[PDB]
Amino acid sequence: DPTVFHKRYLKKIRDLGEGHFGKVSLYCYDPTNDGTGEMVAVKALKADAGPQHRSGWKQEIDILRTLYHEHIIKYKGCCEDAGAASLQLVMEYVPLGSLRDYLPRHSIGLAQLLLFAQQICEGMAYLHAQHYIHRDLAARNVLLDNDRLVKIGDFGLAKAVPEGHEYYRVGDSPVFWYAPECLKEYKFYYASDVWSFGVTLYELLTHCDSSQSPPTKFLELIGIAQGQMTVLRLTELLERGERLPRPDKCPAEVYHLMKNCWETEASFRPTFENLIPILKTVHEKYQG
């Protein structure tokens, strides 16, 4: 699947981001040279990269080729880049950008946040239905299309789960979004994405305020006196049962659900399938 965009019609406008070994850029695709052309977000493999990076990139392209859902960024096509000697990944451009760039500048109410949470779970259930783990679920990878719509917008760490396994075995790791089993056993379950969702939910309820972020909060608890032992120390504080605190005006019951996504024991966490009904009921509740 499907379309081939010719780089001769692609006009670079703007850098939108930088993720793993890729950059996402805004282009205008203008065959008729008119300005009528469509704006598209284009992900490319970085200005230098080795065999590990490249084998990953091919996997990312194939995963995003086969995903199709209301709350997953729309895959539009590829672009030969000869170049870097690989393809560029072309997707729809969502101009409001990530929740991480958006929420710190726009006072969004509780009901809308829970709606986004519901929607993130929907996309994640679908993704788990298709047998993938995301491994990088955080507010910076959730795109606000409008208002009443979010999409999961990046798959750079996503992996298929081996058809006869419960997990995938794994640096650039977003460790402050990771469950203990990922930091310790280096295994990544479906339940491990639910932990990350709990942190993303915490991010939303704090409007992604930089001072309240997980790295900031966790490094305040851990201290920076021994950088060598950050992961070790994070794992111990988590296994001790210490958690990220309640965000201001977070309803008691929502922090409860948050904590339940943070069960130390993975099997005690809800699936994304479990969360969809709970979230949409709590969403409904908070409008009226």
Ligand X SMILES: C[C@@H]1CCN(C(=O)CC#N)C[C@@H]1N(C)c1ncnc2[nH]ccc12
Footprint on this chain of ligand X (rule: CB under 6 A):
16-19, 22-24, 41, 43, 73, 91, 93-94, 97-98, 141, 143, 153-154
Is 23 flagged in the annotation as binding? yes
Is 18 flagged in the annotation as binding? yes
Contact 202, 214 (CB under 8 A): yes
Looking at the Cβ atoms of 93 and 168, the one nearer to ligand X is 93
Distances (CA, A) of 82 to 49, 86, 87, 184: 14, 7, 8, 40
Looking at the Cβ atoms of 98 and 196, the one nearer to ligand X is 98
Nearest-approach distance from CB 157 to ligand X, in angstroms: 11
Nearest-approach distance from CB 49 to ligand X, in angstroms: 12
Instruction: Respond yes or no: is residue 30 known to be catalytic.
Output: no
Nearest-approach distance from CB 91 to ligand X, in angstroms: 4
Looking at the Cβ atoms of 81 and 263, the one nearer to ligand X is 81
Is 21 flagged in the annotation as binding? yes
Distance CA 18, CA 191 (A): 27
- What token pair was written down for 89? 């990944």
β-pairing, 38-45 vs 22-29, is antiparallel
List 15, 62, 101, 136, catalytic entry: 136
The dihedrals phi and psi of 12, each to the nearest 5 degrees, come to -70, 135
Nearest-approach distance from CB 84 to ligand X, in angstroms: 14
Is 128 flagged in the annotation as binding? no
Is 241 flagged in the annotation as binding? no
Is 22 flagged in the annotation as binding? yes
Nearest-approach distance from CB 194 to ligand X, in angstroms: 21
Q: Three-class SS of residue 209?
A: coil
Distance CA 30, CA 146 (A): 25
Looking at the Cβ atoms of 24 and 183, the one nearer to ligand X is 24
Please count the other Cβ atoms lying within 10 Å of the Cβ belonging to residue 157: 20
Distance CA 133, CA 76 (A): 22
Distance CA 255, CA 284 (A): 17
Looking at the Cβ atoms of 26 and 111, the one nearer to ligand X is 26
Contact 214, 199 (CB under 8 A): yes
Distance CA 163, CA 180 (A): 24
Binding site: which residues? 16-24, 43
Active site residues: 136
Q: Residues forming the annotated binding site for ATP? A: 16-24, 43
